[PDB]
Amino acid sequence: GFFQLFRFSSSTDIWLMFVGSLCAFLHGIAQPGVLLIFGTMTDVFIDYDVELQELQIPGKACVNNTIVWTNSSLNQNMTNGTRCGLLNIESEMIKFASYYAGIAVAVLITGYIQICFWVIAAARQIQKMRKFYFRRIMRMEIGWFDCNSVGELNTRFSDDINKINDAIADQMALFIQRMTSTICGFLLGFFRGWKLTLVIISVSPLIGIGAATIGLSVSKFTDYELKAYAKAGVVADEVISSMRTVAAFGGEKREVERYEKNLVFAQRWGIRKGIVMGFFTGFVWCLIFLCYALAFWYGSTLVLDEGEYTPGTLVQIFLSVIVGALNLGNASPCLEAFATGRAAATSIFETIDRKPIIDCMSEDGYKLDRIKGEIEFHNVTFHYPSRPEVKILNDLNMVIKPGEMTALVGPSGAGKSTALQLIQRFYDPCEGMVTVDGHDIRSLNIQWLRDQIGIVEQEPVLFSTTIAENIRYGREDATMEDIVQAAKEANAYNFIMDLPQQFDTLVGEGGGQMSGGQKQRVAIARALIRNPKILLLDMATSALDNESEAMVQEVLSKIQHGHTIISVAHRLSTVRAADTIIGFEHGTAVERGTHEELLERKGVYFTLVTLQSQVRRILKFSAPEWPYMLVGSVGAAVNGTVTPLYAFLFSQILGTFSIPDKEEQRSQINGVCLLFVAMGCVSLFTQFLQGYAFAKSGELLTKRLRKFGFRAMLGQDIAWFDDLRNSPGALTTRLATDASQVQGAAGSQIGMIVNSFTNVTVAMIIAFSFSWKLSLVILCFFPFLALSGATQTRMLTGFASRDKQALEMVGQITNEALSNIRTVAGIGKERRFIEALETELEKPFKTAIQKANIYGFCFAFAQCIMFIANSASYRYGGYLISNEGLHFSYVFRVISAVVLSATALGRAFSYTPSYAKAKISAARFFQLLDRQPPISVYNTAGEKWDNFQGKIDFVDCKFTYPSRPDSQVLNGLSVSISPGQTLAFVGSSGCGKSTSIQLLERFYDPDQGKVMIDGHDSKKVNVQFLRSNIGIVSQEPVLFACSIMDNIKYGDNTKEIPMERVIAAAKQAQLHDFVMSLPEKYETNVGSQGSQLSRGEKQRIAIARAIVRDPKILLLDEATSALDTESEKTVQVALDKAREGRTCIVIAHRLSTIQNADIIAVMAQGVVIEKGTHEELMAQKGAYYKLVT
């Protein structure tokens, strides 16, 4: 519902929203209410000019000029005596100039209450809706998190509640003043004259449809432009990310064709954005100017003869129906903000109240002292609440006698993580209650249950604090003398001394965190500090480095002793010294014995061991765009004069109700309300042209500035893609958003700087030609009105709404308590993370009570400055009607041409992309285009034409990784070759040998120690002619968003694009029978949407992508890392076939790949020591000799 968004309001938060309600009803009557003054004020100007200029003729009775020449100082001689000083102008303008000055004060102080008492009174609810939501989201099960994301529960905390902030706070008071001004705008048009407002009201829904689709079409075309660019920004976001393989196959010159062709969709919603917002700006415009010629043409007849409308109330019923039909349609961009919020709060308001099964309640249970360490599982059966169509635990039965160890052993997945997880009560058994020393796991306090058990996880995860209270989370009572007791027994005390500081070393997450073998040593102290009676460690040393494996398993196996331990094993050589291994095969704990009762029986421990335990820059660049920017700047000089030519002409029709002969008010008033018809029906056209051409110039620019941008980003060094800051998740935001900022320094500045030069010139010239002594009063208020035109269209600096970067500290304390929810529930309490959010949630609240009276202020001073500009300048205008002798038509033409072009000179300076961020956004593309990287594909290709035959010979290759500071030395070595053999590097692990063959292409170059191709050097061997003859294969395979054949097709775009060699390399590369076992012949699309392949049998595409070429050197760099050796043997047949006449370098990490082939040189320092074939690894140690020793 919608009025259910107002729930979380205390009693002091419904009165703070009610004095803002009747100050938004009371501000919202002054916009048609001030027409009551201007109605009756242009009638006292015009009842004075009649008796002035009728006295300006010595005509009819000159012995008594009707009344005038002092016939009021007599006694009773005035039978018609109105033509005297009855109508004193100067004493009447003071009776009007203090009418505006009262509205100016009573709209400054109610335009401040209505928008300070709705941003305060609705940034006080969200501090309570973003707080109940996080308190009940932590009391869920663990099962509710298994079918919800982390990234979906983190846009429903900062991106979704920021939509029911926009519906409650700002757009509600600023709605109800746009609704009580379109009620009083029509009703104060009826009560004056009923028949003269009924004709205008028939076109009044046509002026309001057209002005409700300008506001509703700015914030609705950003749904399309994100959804019409990203059909093409998913092509150049999967080439920059997979950048190693587009280089080595040479598809640089053609990949930008598949991005240029996909790009015109952004070129089409850009041109149909400056038409719809362009044409409908004219269709409002024309319909105002054609409506002035309907209330002054047919409205003249009623005031010309009828007489039942003085000409004041002919411009007062008319200007109040117009201003009550703009404000009707203008309340539609905020009647969208109500329904965006209403539809998007159904997910928050559901999660606030669910009351699920297990939680943090301290009532319903039986707290039980003296647990004797009894664990019992009755006959259970279990289902995950994500994939419920399986019985994971199939009728389990196990007992755990207290005192000593207990194992739990499976083949590969039998009771991997679920069987150890029921006992600390994360999930519930649907049958078979499980019990601990009497009564079962339910009917107990969960706060009591989770204090005995202490778990050691698979992976170590640590919170962002320091190592003092990263241990103190378990059992908060314990002291600094007592933490170190567990910090030594877990063997971190020798890490306490050798540390840059003691007990405050902020290396939790925002510091330099250490290795997993010394992160696992922190969690043991968290589990020992609480004095537990149960232990549970589930593959503790699983994802870490095996050097640490020795010392951390000594702490579990030998140091820990004294009570129950239920510990599974990463490998069974550790769990041999056990009490009762209760391992199993499927679902039911079958063995229940030691290794000697299974010396005669099968089990899964006596089974498994036999197979495992055996600016001028822009305009010159926008060169072909001279026709559109010229027709767009002739059409921007005609609708820049329509703002000061209206004011020259409205005061013309407002003066010719003071021409004395009654017939002249039928043909002078008709030949001026005919110029409005030629002013609307032109500005319906030229407003369209000024919007069409400038959304075609700067659109066809920014389609072309992406094509030149994406080529000169593609063909460069590999050594700056892997630079630190411009990572491929943040380079394609420089090419999506940042390439449209340049549009505001060529195309659209011309439509502001010539739409202002023929605006604030023709307005001054009309102003200064008539009354230069009145034009200097109102021109003092001139800068303060361009602020009321730049705020009327509303993105003034004064919104202060880019304080999202104070919600990032809130957005990190909510992520490190929800992305690791396994280790918060099972360890200690989540009570601190429902006290470390609610502390932190003050700093965005204080910056939404400091914004609530700056946007509160500058909304009112940009609303009371026109009403005081007419107060100090109609006042002085009456000083000149009566004393200095000018006409009354020359006040309306001077006071209204510098304010009618003072609001339009600031309304057009907010509809233009700013210029500060467009003179530097085009200053980083113009350096990206004009950049000369030292190695690149686009070079004029020389230094070529050598018949290769793979004679690639190394001489002392010292290397650095000269971009990323990984080391200062990578291993220098020198290996020669003859064509047809192997280099076969095996040895060190970290960046020593694989760098040297990632060096092999034109990727990196040696600073020293130059290499040869055929006696040449790889600074004077070109990139294009070398790379035709290599063949690489990578570690992670990557296949593009195409079919099976098309990636096989992708191997060579250099030649005539082959079909003939796919058949010859189908049965060679061992895919000829898997390409026939498919749902379709070759159109199996495996990119992003179809059924995904296995990496173990995607390698067979990754090898086969190379061999469609005619390579002279292979680069078999680190394939075949599939963890199932059945599928490894399938591709191991495939690597053996890509040989017999081709140079190879195969690293062969798993040593069964080929051994007797050729030399083995690299080592830990990588020095060439063994230039020898495989028979020389007996007297000196080699690859196989180390693992057998």
Ligand SMILES: C[C@H](CCC(=O)NCCS(=O)(=O)O)[C@H]1CC[C@H]2[C@@H]3[C@H](O)C[C@@H]4C[C@H](O)CC[C@]4(C)[C@H]3C[C@H](O)[C@]12C
């Ligand atoms: C009629 C309005 C003036 C009354 C007013 O001040 N309302 C309160 C201001 S708000 O609640 O804070 O927006 C103004 C404000 C916004 C104006 C519109 C917007 O500026 C959008 C375009 C701008 C074009 O230059 C003219 C047509 C137009 C479609 C404008 C017509 C008209 O002058 C509007 C509708």
Ligand SMILES: C[C@H](CCC(=O)NCCS(=O)(=O)O)[C@H]1CC[C@H]2[C@@H]3[C@H](O)C[C@@H]4C[C@H](O)CC[C@]4(C)[C@H]3C[C@H](O)[C@]12C
């Ligand atoms: C007259 C209307 C209300 C403001 C006003 O001038 N009232 C005079 C009384 S007082 O001084 O406030 O006392 C305003 C509101 C919207 C305005 C119109 C819109 O801004 C659209 C265009 C804008 C062009 O610059 C001028 C013509 C015009 C068609 C405007 C004429 C006039 O200024 C309108 C109709």
